[PDB]
Amino acid sequence: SHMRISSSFSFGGFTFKRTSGSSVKREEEVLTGNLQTLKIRVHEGYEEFTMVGRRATAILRKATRRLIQLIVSGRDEQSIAEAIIVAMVFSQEDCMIKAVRGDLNFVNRANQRLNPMHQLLRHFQKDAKVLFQNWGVEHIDNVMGMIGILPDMTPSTEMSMRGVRISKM
């Protein structure tokens, strides 16, 4: 049932669909720098998702708590950043957890406490500076139709945030 439920869903304003590979679920306690414990539902294994939003789309390959490749197209800098934020949170990477600042106590529109993955999502939806700063950058190859993006959102032909590429298409 875990495979079935995680095959198609909405997260962070994006429709996710699994296109390849599998995972198993498990509950994993993590600790933010503010020493807050979050019990997250972790996907264990290699999978590939497509993400479709209002103003951006992405393709994501990930493994257990590790983003492998992310390609995003968007209408503008804002919508592209938004897609990158959701992918980074969804990746469940340690460096994303470690980018949290302060305590998370987000509530939905009925004033009920949001689940841990949504605590993370809400947090970084407000400001992704620490997230992008701590994610990491790498050298990239020059591939036609693709360009890198730095943590300050400036495009670069030489470097990019780790695993992240922006499609000109």
Numbering used by the authors: 315 to 483
Article sentences:
Two mutations (P453H and I471T) were introduced because these positions are surface of the protein and far from cap-binding site. These mutations increased the solubility so that the final protein was stable in 50 mM Tris-HCl (pH 8.0), 200 mM NaCl. We collected the native data sets at 2.00 Å resolution with in-house X-ray generator and detector. There was one molecule in an asymmetric unit. This crystal contains large solvent content (70%), and two mutations P453H and I471T located on the solvent accessible surface in the crystal packing. However, compared with the reported structure of PB2 middle domain, in native, one large structural change could be seen: N-terminal region formed one additional α-helix which consists of 315SHMRISS321. The first three residues (315SHM317) are additional residues derived from pET15b vector. The side chain of H316 interacts with S336 and it seems to stabilize this α-helix. On the other hand, by m7GTP soaking, the α-helix deformed to a flexible structure as describe later. The final Rwork (Rfree) of apo and m7GTP-bound form were 18.6% (22.8%) and 17.8% (21.2%), respectively.
Within the influenza virus, three RNA-polymerase proteins (PA, PB1 and PB2), the nucleoprotein (NP) and the viral RNAs form the ribonucleoprotein (RNP) complex. PB2 mediates the cap-snatching mechanism; i.e., it binds the capped mRNA of the host for transcription of the influenza genome. Here we report PB2 middle domain structure (318-483) belonging to subtype H1N1 human influenza with m7GTP, which has two mutations (P453H, I471T) to increase solubility of this domain. The overall fold was the same as reported structure: a four helix bundle (α1 ~ α4) was wrapped by three parts of β-sheet ((1) β1, β2, β5, β6 and β7 (2), β8 〜 β12 and (3) β3 ~ β4).
